[model samples]
Target: VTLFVALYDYQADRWTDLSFHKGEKFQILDASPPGDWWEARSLTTGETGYIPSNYVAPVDS
Candidate 1:
């Protein structure tokens, strides 16, 4: 699984919201379309949904 770190706190306000707190790790399930929004599943929670691309950054190291 491709891991990413949430850059900002997000709470699910809609069906597309993928709730993840800032500094939390989540997996990129898919980076589809224009890549503006990424399809991800939170490591904190098993639920899968869309999150803003800017909300996360890919891990390296």
Candidate 2:
């Protein structure tokens, strides 16, 4: 999945936004049971963080 928009100010207890911008891709490591959040690793930076599941979309790679 990819972050279609930037999320620089995300905060939720121990969860934080993956700090990415448009066109940045990520590999979905884990998804929440409710499907609202996902643990992803940045393709460019190799950083891992939680992101809103809806914030990403599948890209035709």
Reference-based TM-score, model 2? 0.65
Model 2: which residue pairs collide?
A: none
Q: Among these predicted structures, which one has the highest TM-score? A: 1
> Across residues 2-44, which tens digit of lDDT does each residue of candidate 2 receive?
4333333344455465666766677887774665777888787
Error of 2 at 9 (Å): 11
Span of 10 residues, lowest total lDDT, candidate 2? 2-11
Query: For residues 1-61, what per-residue lDDT tens digits would candidate 1 score against the true structure?
Result: 4898888898777788787789888788888578578888888888888888877888663
- Candidate 1: deviation at residue 12, Å? 3.3
